[PDB]
Each structure stands twice: as C-alpha cells, then as structure tokens.
Amino acid sequence: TKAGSLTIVGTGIESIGQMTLQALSYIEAAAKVFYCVIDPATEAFILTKNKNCVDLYQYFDNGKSRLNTYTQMSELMVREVRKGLDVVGVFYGHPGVFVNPSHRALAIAKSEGYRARMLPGVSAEDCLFADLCIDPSNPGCLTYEASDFLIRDRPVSIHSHLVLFQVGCVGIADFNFTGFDNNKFGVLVDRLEQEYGAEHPVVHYIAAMMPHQDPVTDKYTVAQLREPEIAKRVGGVSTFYIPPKARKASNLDIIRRLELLPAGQVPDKKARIYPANQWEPDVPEVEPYRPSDQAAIAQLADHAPPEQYQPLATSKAMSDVMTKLALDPKALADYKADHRAFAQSVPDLTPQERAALELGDSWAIRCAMKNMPSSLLDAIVVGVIGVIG
Amino acid sequence: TKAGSLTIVGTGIESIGQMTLQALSYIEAAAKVFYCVIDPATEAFILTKNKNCVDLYQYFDNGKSRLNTYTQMSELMVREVRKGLDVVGVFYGHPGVFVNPSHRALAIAKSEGYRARMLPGVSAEDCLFADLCIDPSNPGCLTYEASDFLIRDRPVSIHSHLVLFQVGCVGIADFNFTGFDNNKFGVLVDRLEQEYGAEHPVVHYIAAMMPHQDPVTDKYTVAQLREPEIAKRVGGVSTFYIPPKARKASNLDIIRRLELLPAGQVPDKKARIYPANQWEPDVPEVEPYRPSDQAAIAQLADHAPPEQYQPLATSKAMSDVMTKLALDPKALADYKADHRAFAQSVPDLTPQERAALELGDSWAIRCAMKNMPSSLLDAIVVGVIGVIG
Ligand SMILES: C[S@@+](CC[C@H](N)C(=O)[O-])C[C@H]1O[C@@H](n2cnc3c(N)ncnc32)[C@H](O)[C@@H]1O
Ligand SMILES: C[S@@+](CC[C@H](N)C(=O)[O-])C[C@H]1O[C@@H](n2cnc3c(N)ncnc32)[C@H](O)[C@@H]1O
Ligand SMILES: [Cl-]
Ligand SMILES: [Cl-]
Ligand SMILES: [Cl-]
Ligand SMILES: [Cl-]
C-alpha cells in the first residue's frame, strides 16, 4: 500500500447541520483539507476542525473558463496525495451530484494506485423531496441539468416527477463574481410549454441555507415564468420541480404474469394511497382514515411482538466499539489491518462479541447483538418494502 | 401555536457514520422516538441518545399486509403528537425516499395544525453515485421502483442512467421474517432484454452497511441474470444500475438559439470530459492531461486571489452562535421566537454581528462574516456550475 489517500466528502445544503458524522471525522483526521462551500458559517466551522485548509473558490475568476478552474482544483488535491499525505476534499451538498472536479481528482488518484473514496452527502434533490413532500418512488423521477436537457433534447415523462438543476444559468460556460446574466431563460420556458402546456404548474425551489430560514416553494404556471418580475427571482441556487400531468394505467400482461388479479378489479388509476401529491393539477382529496385503516388501528390494543421478532440484546462494550469503528478513521484502519489483534485489545467484550469481531462477517455481528428466537431458525436483511401500486 | 410536533429524520445507509449532525440533535431533544432501522449497531446507538424509544419493526408480521403495518406505524407517532409531545420518527437512509409511513404521518399532523417537518438524509441512490463513480447530471438519471416499472410500463431512456430499487421483491405486497421468495424475477429480466439487449451490462449494487465492509459492485449481462446462482444473490437490500447504451447528439436549433457556435464545430458526441463512465459498454479511454489541461496547471505558479474574491473574516463569538443555531434545536426555537432578545443575550458579539443577528437576513450575516472588496460592490450565491456539454 502506497502512502497517500484522497477522500472526498460533502457538507449537505443547510449550514453545518446537514454534514454527516463521518464527513466531520475525516475532515478532523486529514493532513490537508481543500473546500468549496457557499455559506460562511459552514466555512468557519470547517476551519475550527482542521489547521491546514485551502479555499478552492479562489480559483474561479471573471471570464476564466470553469473547466480550467476545475482542472486546477483537481490538481491541487492530487499533488498533495502524490507527496504521501491523507487529503480530504469538501464540496457542498453531495460531492458527486452535479460536480466536475471531485470525479476527476478521484479517477486520477485511483489510476496512479492511491487509495480513493467518495463519501455520500445530502443533495439539493434530497432537500427537495423533504420540503415538497414527495417520494421519488411514486411515480418515478427524472433528473437533468437544464442546459443539457435542452441541447441534447432529453425526454420528459408526463406521468413521473421532473427535476431540473441549474435553471438560473441556461447556456453559460464561464463565471462572474456578481452573478449570471440569464438572458436565454426563455428557451427553457418554450420547451416546458411544448411538453406540458401553458397552464401546467412549475415549482421554484430554493432549500434554506441557514437554520432559521424557510425554503422557497413558489408555484407558477409555465406562462407566468415569462413575466420579468418572476423570471428575475431565478438564480444560482434555484431548482425547478415539475409535477406529473396524468396517472399511468396498468399493463394487463404484467398483471397476469405477476398473478395480481383473482379475476376482477385492481385499484383504479386515481384510487391513490394517502397522501396525494399536492402539486399535481386537479388532484382529488384522498381519505386518510378508510374502514381498512380504522380496523388496523383497532388492532393496536391487543398487539404483542411476533414470536419471530429479534429484540436487541447487546452490551455497552460492544456498542462502544461499533460506534468507534464508525466515528474514528484511525481505529477503522487499525481494525481492517488486523481483525484479530484489534479484537483482542478491546476491553470488556464477552467471548461471543470478541469472536464476532475477529471474523468480521455481518451474520456473526448480528447474532452477537440480537436475540434470535427458535421460531425464526426453524424455517437476510428485510427492511417500508415500499408500495407504489 | 399548538403544543406537539413531528420531525422525521434519517440515519443514512452505512451504520452510524451517515447520520447527519441535525438528525442526531433532534433525536437527543425529543420527548419520544420511534425508529425503523436495519442494523443493530445503529439501533444500539439511537438507544444511547434518548431514554424513550419504540422500535416500529415489531409491527410487521408474517402474512400481515404491509399497508396495515404502515397505517399502524403512522398512528403510533401521531397519537403522541396529539398529546402535545415533541415526537421524532427515524427511518434508515433518507426517510422520504421509498418510504410510505413517514409521508402519511407528516400529512396527518400538518392537516390537524401541528408543526411537521422532514429532515433529509443520505439515500441508497446517494451511496450508489459515490460507489459506482457516476454523476446523475451526466447524462441524466431515471429512478423507479421495480414492480411499478413493470406494472405501469414506465419508459426507459437508453441515453441516460437507470436506477431500479426493490429488485429483490418483484410483485410482493406482504412480509416474511425469513425473507422474500422472489419467484417473478424473470419478468424483470424479460423487460431489460427487450429494452437493452441480452449482452448489455447490469450492475448489482449493495452499499456497505458496516464501516469495515466493501460494497457489492458486480457487473453482469442481462442474459447472466437468468442463471440460478446469480439470481439467488439478489435480495432485500439490492439495487440495479443500468448504464447508457449510446450517446445522444445535439439539437441544431438549440445550439443556434443559445449562441454556442461561432459557425463551426461543437465537440463530437464521443469527445467526453474526463473521466468517462466505466460501466458503459465499449467506452473509449479519455485523456486526463490534454494540452489545455497542462496549460491550466502551468498557471498555478503565478496565481493570486482575484480582487473580487471575498475572504472569510469572522470571530469566535459569531462562529459559535451560528454553530449553536445549527446544533441546538432549543436555541434555534428561542432565536426564531424573538431575534432581538436572543441576539442581545449572546456574549462577545461585535456591534455589526449583533445587528445582523437581530435582522436575520442572509446578506446581513454574509457582510458580518466576509470581507467585501470595493471592486465587487462597484459592479447572489454563486456556487461546480456543472458542465455537461
Ligand atoms: C453545481 S450544482 C451543485 C449541487 C450540489 N452538489 C448538490 O448536492 O445539490 C449547483 C445546482 O444545485 C442546485 N442547488 C444548490 N443549492 C441549492 C438550494 N439551496 N436549493 C435548491 N437547489 C440548489 C441548483 O440547481 C444549482 O444550480
Ligand atoms: C423501502 S426502500 C427504503 C430506501 C431508503 N429509505 C433509502 O433512503 O435508500 C428499500 C430499498 O432500498 C434499497 N436499499 C436499501 N439498502 C440498500 C443498500 N445497502 N444498498 C443498495 N440498495 C439499498 C433497495 O433497493 C431496497 O429494496
Ligand atoms: Cl439532515
Ligand atoms: Cl392489522
Ligand atoms: Cl457520509
Ligand atoms: Cl487557466
């Protein structure tokens, strides 16, 4: 194993709070940190956690091509990896969602034989699902960059969710500190009219970046986007959500091959599971407490845990070590290098706990931490299967 | 404002480390916690952080409809909200991505006039982007539930990414503790053959759930999925990634309306930005260090910060308060109730810092924490615009 590593992490969107515990731990452990974030409280927070940080944002300039900036950002990181250092790069949101230089730097490091990894983070689309109260599963989700959407004529589906990033800089390859002149926004609006119609809703979304702020969740018709006062509000952190225009019917051949009908009625196209999408045009009110829902709630009084349910049955020493492996990158590296040596130095473990850690396999760790009933083993991670039908 | 609130949060996918700082803080502050997670180290961690927790997983049972379980899960949470308590629900990953009961409970609470919010988390798709080294922006992403994909005959795009959740339980509406009998998996494989061809790649993806584990990133042809030994490996935490089959050309009308050509050549369909997607079939090698890349790197020696760059210029007292607002839900609530009273009780703030906190607006906070050069204001969040073209 060569000296030198690159780990790229995210900060999430809302200042400080949306950073993951592991992103923080890698920032603290790093020899050198390079960052690109867009609020000052997050920047100040990062600087309290490591003594050797560099702001990547200084490599943008007026009329300097963004591609040249991204090549420079990547090279600054990889140069320190080649010197044998543990390097961490930090980007706002998820560091691989609509980001060029992270993928470039990781690919170069990997090709030259260094350790290289991206840790996921909370994206602007993750925030959109939470704030607009929608699930990508119901009824599917298409996600594009707005200029790419137009130039490559990417297809829409009127029966699924549509999410468009970078709607505030249609057709722009450069940078300006004061901001974008979004003079080709009308080209996007023309496309949305063609696909959806002039009276179809478009939601202008901006996630709150400070903890006390509310999100922007402003619904407009496609036609209203042509009004100059409304067009002016779309900027560099704006995303569009376009809800479905209609409900898609079921395929009879698939119903039969999956054996879903006992010769009769599947639910109708608009027999929706509560709650319905509030952004869809002409969406009917769905009943939250149907007779079937009331009967399920009545069964709560007599409920007992099923006999095949596996209750947690662990110890402080075992929960402490599993927490340490997740929150201490040095401890994890030590454990990975020698499972047996590490396991034998952990204080207060029971014999079973020690043995499970020595092996490292999931089933062993599960047996050590959960009580498995006889019922279960006289007959496999089974985590809300979602129902869309 | 009525007493009682519901906040639903996520844990991310990888044990403990992928929880956000704000998710942890709300779990600690809650009067009552309800959770549904699928590894025991995460469960044990949650129980160390609040004294009043209930496992929602005990409401599943063999041959009990999942919809009835979800109605029960929702009702247990909302009952405590109606009593005037601050309630937190916890689901693995992102709590609104392929999850029924979170959306139901939040909608009921909101309709009855209680405070209701979802905090985003790291999803299985977020992990997929990071581990497979792909960006949803290049060249767009379609995301579906596998049974819905089949039953509603949802469209594919051979030029964009495809992600399918719940490929281990095609056509199943119920639960079993030992697991799913995935006997209709061949119906999915038939559809993938029709859309992509028998020799097109499909990546079987399972994100690591413990910190020391590696992810499963196993590429197969569509044809290979019919082999019983391979089909057997697909389970309840399996997701499929299907890469594009071809590159989409540019539209001449849009090129002209966005003014991208000076009468000549736009880059060719396969003149890719480094790095290329390694999962695409017959993808050519892309040069990481072209002459333009070498010239950009040569400019690093003479680089200085641009005159319109805004360096961080804050204080310990200001960074401490902004951190507290993000990490202490009680402090945030106090600040939101009375900006001026809160601001005047914060120790050691400068006059400008105090004034910015009193107002609460983003531009005021930015001025207080960053030095704004004369160059800038003699002429707006501008955070990697991604280039896809
Ligand atoms: C270069 S990308 C970076 C995205 C980021 N890595 C992420 O994980 O969301 C910039 C685009 O992200 C979206 N974005 C960034 N901040 C946002 C916010 N606060 N609300 C909504 N969308 C945002 C916008 O579409 C913006 O044009
Ligand atoms: C009911 S959903 C819940 C998803 C979860 N809320 C999230 O944010 O990803 C279950 C599906 O998520 C995906 N999933 C869950 N854990 C996973 C893992 N470790 N790797 C890949 N996919 C996973 C699988 O497609 C699975 O069938
Ligand atoms: Cl969060
Ligand atoms: Cl029931
Ligand atoms: Cl993370
Ligand atoms: Cl340059």
Author numbering:
A (entry chain A), B (entry chain A): 7 to 385, 402 to 411
The article reads:
While chemical methylation of an amide bond uses a strong base to generate the imidate, OphA, the precursor protein of the fungal peptide macrocycle omphalotin A, self-hypermethylates amides at pH 7 using S-adenosyl methionine (SAM) as cofactor. Omphalotin A derives from the C terminus of the OphA protein, and it is the OphA protein that methylates its own C terminus using S-adenosyl methionine (SAM). The structure of OphA reveals a complex catenane-like arrangement in which the peptide substrate is clamped with its amide nitrogen aligned for nucleophilic attack on the methyl group of SAM. Here, we report the structure of the peptide amide methyltransferase OphA including complexes with cofactor [SAM and S-adenosyl homocysteine (SAH)], cofactor analog, substrate, and product.
Mutants Y63F, Y66F, Y76F, R72A, R72K, Y98A, Y98F, Q172A, and W400A of OphAΔC6 were expressed in E. coli. Y63F, Y66F, Y76F, R72A, Y98A, and W400A were incubated with SAM and analyzed. The peptide carbonyl at i−3 hydrogen-bonds to the side chain of Tyr63, at i−2 to the side chain of Tyr98, and at i−1 to both Tyr66 and Tyr76. Y66F retains activity, and Tyr76, although within 4 Å of the carbonyl, has a Bürgi-Dunitz (44°) angle incompatible with attack, so both possibilities were discarded. Both Tyr66 and Tyr76 are, however, well positioned to stabilize the resulting tetrahedral carbon by hydrogen bonding. The resulting negatively charged oxygen of the imidate would be stabilized by hydrogen bonds to Tyr66 and Tyr76.
